[PDB]
Write a protein that holds these residues in place. Structure first.
Motif, mmCIF file in Angstrom:
data_model
loop_
_atom_site.group_PDB
_atom_site.id
_atom_site.type_symbol
_atom_site.label_atom_id
_atom_site.label_comp_id
_atom_site.label_asym_id
_atom_site.label_seq_id
_atom_site.Cartn_x
_atom_site.Cartn_y
_atom_site.Cartn_z
ATOM 1 N N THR A 1 0.410 -7.275 -30.523
ATOM 2 C CA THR A 1 0.747 -8.417 -31.349
ATOM 3 C C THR A 1 2.136 -9.004 -31.052
ATOM 4 O OG1 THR A 1 0.659 -9.252 -33.614
ATOM 5 C CG2 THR A 1 1.787 -7.161 -33.281
ATOM 6 N N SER A 2 3.007 -8.195 -30.454
ATOM 7 C CA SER A 2 4.370 -8.631 -30.145
ATOM 8 C C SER A 2 4.565 -8.940 -28.664
ATOM 9 C CB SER A 2 5.384 -7.571 -30.582
ATOM 10 O OG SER A 2 5.379 -7.414 -31.990
ATOM 11 N N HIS A 3 3.488 -8.853 -27.888
ATOM 12 C CA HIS A 3 3.541 -9.200 -26.471
ATOM 13 C C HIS A 3 3.798 -10.703 -26.330
ATOM 14 C CE1 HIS A 3 2.375 -9.718 -22.270
ATOM 15 N NE2 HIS A 3 2.279 -8.412 -22.131
ATOM 16 N N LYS A 4 4.614 -11.073 -25.345
ATOM 17 C CA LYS A 4 4.985 -12.466 -25.118
ATOM 18 C C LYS A 4 3.775 -13.364 -24.841
ATOM 19 C CE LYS A 4 6.101 -11.449 -20.281
ATOM 20 N NZ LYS A 4 5.175 -12.424 -19.643
ATOM 21 N N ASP A 5 2.692 -12.763 -24.347
ATOM 22 C CA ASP A 5 1.480 -13.501 -23.987
ATOM 23 C C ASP A 5 0.282 -13.183 -24.873
ATOM 24 O OD1 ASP A 5 2.620 -12.932 -20.755
ATOM 25 O OD2 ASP A 5 2.439 -14.937 -21.608
ATOM 26 N N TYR A 6 0.528 -12.660 -26.069
ATOM 27 C CA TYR A 6 -0.550 -12.407 -27.014
ATOM 28 C C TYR A 6 -1.232 -13.732 -27.372
ATOM 29 C CZ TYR A 6 -3.018 -10.924 -31.252
ATOM 30 O OH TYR A 6 -3.957 -10.646 -32.215
#
Ligand SMILES: NC(=O)c1ccc[n+]([C@@H]2O[C@H](COP(=O)([O-])OP(=O)(O)OC[C@H]3O[C@@H](n4cnc5c(N)ncnc54)[C@H](OP(=O)(O)O)[C@@H]3O)[C@@H](O)[C@H]2O)c1
Ligand SMILES: O=C(O)Cc1ccccc1O
Length: 315
Positions: free
Chosen positions: A304-309
């Motif tokens: 959920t906190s990934h830059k590409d979510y």
């Protein structure tokens, strides 16, 4: 037999067999039965851990002269730990050797999120969260493009990309191959009308996954909704003398989507095929669309906190 035309000139079977969660000791038989019943489209992925056993089934049907290789449409997917430039070809070749083919028909970027390379599919730190790669979607796409130029895959595509991430690829400087397909979650509780309208306006084919709501997903709860047992969908099925499953597989087909239900059960594999001999009315279709709740089976909640979510944007 029917089939949809991709922007590379090939034809993709509108029905396919899914293999996520199909055990290694049951899936070879499941794919063999599917091909016998008339399936010409198998959906695979490295992360499912069963591509060797799917490959055994495909090879057996080829030896038997049941199908020739050009009749089949085999899909696999690049997992998130293989997004770096120099690893994309290696990941494709391992999938090709496990399936025992010399080319794939369609190869997707499974998720837009890149993870740190390694043996673990979801690599963790000392705090317990997923470690991201510093790679981006555009560099991974350039790597997927050279697989086409090298003859390992006929078409390339994407999966779980929102409309802005697909835009990034369409606007990429020096774009050589357009995405042929965006494979997304789609069923009456998540109808995806905006993302489907956007993809279809740009000539990208949509594949609908988890069409029956994925009742066997390992994170299932008792108080979660159940498509197969919805009384309103039971009513529409009963009117057509079909099962609820057959109605849920027909529904995306009349929206011009490819649909890929999973089953390891030979009688359900056969049932899921008998969908070409009836029509849902425009009233049935509009009613099924009204059941939208914006509910996701596959939400990749650890990233959920990934830059590409992909699922922070509306569509
Ligand atoms: N691109 C991605 O990120 C991604 C993510 C998720 C899924 N997918 C693909 O889409 C495929 C399908 O989605 P899914 O596996 O999540 O779920 P699904 O196809 O919606 O449902 C599979 C479940 O429904 C049961 N079932 C099948 N036919 C039925 C019938 N006629 N009557 C009653 N129950 C029935 C199956 O049981 P039995 O097997 O016991 O018959 C299984 O438990 C996956 O296998 C995979 O290929 C891709
Ligand atoms: O993305 C998919 O196809 C489904 C899947 C399979 C294995 C691990 C995680 C996961 O979301």
């Amino acid at each position: 037999a029917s089939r949809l035309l991709l922007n590379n000139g090939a034809k993709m079977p509108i029905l396919g067999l899914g293999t996520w969660k199909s055990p290694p000791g049951q899936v070879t038989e499941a794919v063999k039965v599917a091909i016998d019943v008339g399936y010409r489209h198998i959906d695979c992925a490295h992360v499912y851990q069963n591509e060797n056993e799917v490959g055994v089934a495909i090879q057996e049907k080829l030896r038997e002269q049941v199908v020739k290789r050009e009749e089949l449409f085999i899909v696999s997917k690049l997992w998130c730990t293989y997004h770096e430039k120099g690893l994309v070809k290696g990941a494709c070749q391992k999938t090709l050797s496990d399936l025992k083919l010399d080319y794939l028909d369609l190869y997707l970027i499974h998720w837009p999120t890149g993870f740190k390379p390694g043996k673990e599919f979801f690599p963790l730190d000392e705090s317990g969260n997923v470690v991201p790669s510093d790679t981006n979607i555009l560099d991974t796409w350039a790597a997927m493009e050279e697989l086409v130029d090298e003859g390992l895959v006929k078409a390339i595509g994407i999966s779980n990309f929102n409309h802005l991430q697909v835009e990034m690829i369409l606007n990429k400087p020096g774009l050589k191959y357009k995405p042929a397909v965006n494979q997304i979650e789609c069923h009456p509780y998540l109808t995806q009308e905006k993302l489907i309208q956007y993809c279809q306006s740009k000539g990208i084919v949509v594949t609908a996954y988890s069409p029956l709501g994925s009742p066997d997903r390992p994170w299932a709860k008792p108080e979660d909704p159940s498509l197969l047992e919805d009384p309103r969908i039971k009513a529409i099925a009963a009117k057509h003398n079909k099962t609820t499953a057959q109605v849920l597989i027909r529904f995306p087909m009349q929206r011009n989507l490819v649909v890929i239900p999973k089953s390891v059960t030979p009688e359900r594999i056969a049932e899921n095929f008998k969908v070409f001999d009836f029509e849902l009315s425009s009233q049935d279709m509009t009613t099924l669309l009204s059941y939208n709740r914006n509910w996701r089976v596959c939400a990749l909640l650890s990233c959920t906190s990934h830059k590409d979510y992909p699922f922070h944007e509306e569509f």
